[PDB]
Design a protein around this ligand. Structure first.
Ligand SMILES: CCc1cc2[nH]c(=O)c(C#N)c(-c3ccc(NS(C)(=O)=O)cc3)c2c(C)n1
Ligand code: NA
Length: 186
């Protein structure tokens, strides 16, 4: 089973990934995890992070440019992801493809039915062949540009409400991991 944990920065995603891992293992299930972006391993990731800090000219001015780099990062790990899905009962990703839909849409003042979010699907799932997650779990918290961060949180909620790329659950900071693991299990 492939699960992606999503949300804005400071939502506490990694804490949830770890809480979920423990719960799945307590339930008898093997777990492996990966985090995106793969800063330090992916040149595309690194150039993207670097662009957001003003390097690489006018690169960061293009939403689709940044989205492409982050996509290329994930596409590089496609064989790793498919390997974990064979080796383990549950693979949890700290960020996945929906990060690209939410952050790009938000920046472009588009909604989840908009062009960018659709493009992301065409590019990452169809073209680049990234597997669709069985579940995407949005961690939605009150407080993690802040208007952009809150707009991203909202668009996330909209991907969840529309079942973008598959089934979602939306959860809070205090969700019970044992109960969440039971809901996610096949
Ligand atoms: C310009 C539009 C745009 C598109 C994006 N697409 C992605 O796929 C993606 C991812 N993953 C991110 C991203 C990367 C790191 C983050 N947070 S972090 C690890 O704590 O630095 C938060 C978001 C992303 C961003 C920031 N912006
Ligand atoms: Na727009």
């Amino acid at each position: 089973m492939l699960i992606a944990i999503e949300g804005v920065d400071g939502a506490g995603k990694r804490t949830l990934v770890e809480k979920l891992s423990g719960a799945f293992r307590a339930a008898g299930r093997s777990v492996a995890t990966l985090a995106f972006p793969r800063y330090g391993q992916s040149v595309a990731a690194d150039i993207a992070a670097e662009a957001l800090h003003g390097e690489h000219g006018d690169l960061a001015s293009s939403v689709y440019a940044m989205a492409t780099l982050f996509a290329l990062d994930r596409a590089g790990a496609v064989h790793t992801i498919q390997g974990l899905c064979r080796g383990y009962d549950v693979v949890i990703l700290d960020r996945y493809v929906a990060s690209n839909a939410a952050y790009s849409a938000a920046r472009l003042h588009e909604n989840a039915a908009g062009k960018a979010a659709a493009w992301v699907q065409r590019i990452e799932f169809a073209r680049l062949g990234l597997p669709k997650p069985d579940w995407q779990v949005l961690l939605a918290v009150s407080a993690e540009d802040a208007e952009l961060q809150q707009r991203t949180g909202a668009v996330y909620a909209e991907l969840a409400a529309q079942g973008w790329g598959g089934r979602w659950l939306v959860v809070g900071a205090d969700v019970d991991p044992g109960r969440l693991a039971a809901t996610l299990a096949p």
